[PDB]
Amino acid sequence: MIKQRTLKNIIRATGVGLHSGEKVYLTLKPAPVDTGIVFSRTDLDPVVEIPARAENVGETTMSTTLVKGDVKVDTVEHLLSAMAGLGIDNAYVELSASEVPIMDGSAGPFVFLIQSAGLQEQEAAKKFIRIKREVSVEEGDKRAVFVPFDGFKVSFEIDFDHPVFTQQASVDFSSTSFVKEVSRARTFGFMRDIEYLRSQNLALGGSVENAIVVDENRVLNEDGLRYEDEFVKHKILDAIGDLYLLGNSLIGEFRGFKSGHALNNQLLRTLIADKDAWEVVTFEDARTAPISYMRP
Ligand SMILES: COC[C@@H](O)c1ccc(C#Cc2ccc(C(=O)NC[C@H]3C[C@@H](NC(=O)[C@@H]4C[C@H](F)CN4)CN3C(=O)C3CC3)cc2)cc1
Ligand SMILES: [Zn+2]
């Protein structure tokens, strides 16, 4: 059968919060069957824990935020994308501060730290959410859709009127490596936006070392892009992180059109509410299942 996965070993990492500019110590820990992903602010006494579930998502600010009262964890989407891409079901994420470290601006450093630890299969069937019906959310010119699909696929389109800006990509993850083709795609920022955010005490940890910095015309990063389509690949990365707040891996297709965290969360809420549009399924036989995972 397809089995739940956690970490084999604890992972420790250091970085800076994109927005906070705060040094943050990150620990990923193995967790029991049916824990899901749980974030933990260990700088607090008592320690405050927020399950990485759509119901805990906060005011859809600059990034995906988990809240519980007046406690938050900022910018969870790149880490959850790394955990989604590798099929991790159960894990404790401990943070010394309010924001997940940005690292290089991609999921690459997290996927590497996790695959360095290795994964442990657990004695329990992995539960999948299978899309049975199309679920569509729109707001203005933005659109986010689930389509039934025997597998896992993410299609994305962006549309910037900007000299730097392939603005479309589709990845079937059963035939294309999240690790190689998506995970290294970095966050990006326009200089006019970054100058505004800085003026408002935001982007305090931003640098060419953790973001593609774009002025009116070109990428300012001396070493350029990792992919010709890095921008729309990063959109796909962020969508994979947000999808993982369902708390179960998806069997279906996601289509984004200029979508972002706020509409992505409207789509998760609408899917969860419409119980006719999905079912929980397990696979007693991995060989006939529409998705596959790497060796642990
Ligand atoms: C040494 O410093 C000195 C100096 O040079 C310097 C250099 C750099 C910085 C910085 C920085 C920085 C600040 C904010 C952002 C950001 O929010 N990007 C949003 C982008 C990326 C994507 N969204 C995402 O990736 C979401 C949102 C987060 F980005 C994570 N997930 C969607 N998206 C948009 O659609 C944009 C067009 C609206 C990125 C980088 C500061 C100072
Ligand atoms: Zn991002």
From Swiss-Prot:
GO terms for biological process: lipid A biosynthetic process. The keyword Flavoprotein does not apply. Its EC number is 3.5.1.108. It catalyses: a UDP-3-O-[(3R)-3-hydroxyacyl]-N-acetyl-alpha-D-glucosamine + H2O = a UDP-3-O-[(3R)-3-hydroxyacyl]-alpha-D-glucosamine + acetate. Keywords: Hydrolase, Lipid A biosynthesis, Lipid biosynthesis, Lipid metabolism, Metal-binding, Zinc. SUPFAM superfamilies: Ribosomal protein S5 domain 2-like. One of its GO terms (cellular component) is membrane. Pathway: Glycolipid biosynthesis; lipid IV(A) biosynthesis; lipid IV(A) from (3R)-3-hydroxytetradecanoyl-[acyl-carrier-protein] and UDP-N-acetyl-alpha-D-glucosamine: step 2/6. One of its GO terms (molecular function) is UDP-3-O-acyl-N-acetylglucosamine deacetylase activity. The active site is at 261 (proton donor). Zn(2+) binds at residues 78, 234, 238. It is an enzyme of class 3 (hydrolase). Its cofactor is Zn(2+). InterPro entries: Ribosomal_Su5_D2-typ_SF, UDP-acyl_GlcNac_deAcase, UDP-acyl_GlcNac_deAcase_C, UDP-acyl_N-AcGlcN_deAcase_N. The keyword Amino-acid biosynthesis does not apply. NCBIfam families: lpxC. Belongs to the LpxC family. Catalyzes the hydrolysis of UDP-3-O-myristoyl-N-acetylglucosamine to form UDP-3-O-myristoylglucosamine and acetate, the committed step in lipid A biosynthesis. This is UDP-3-O-acyl-N-acetylglucosamine deacetylase. The lineage of its organism: Bacteria, Pseudomonadati, Pseudomonadota, Gammaproteobacteria, Pseudomonadales.
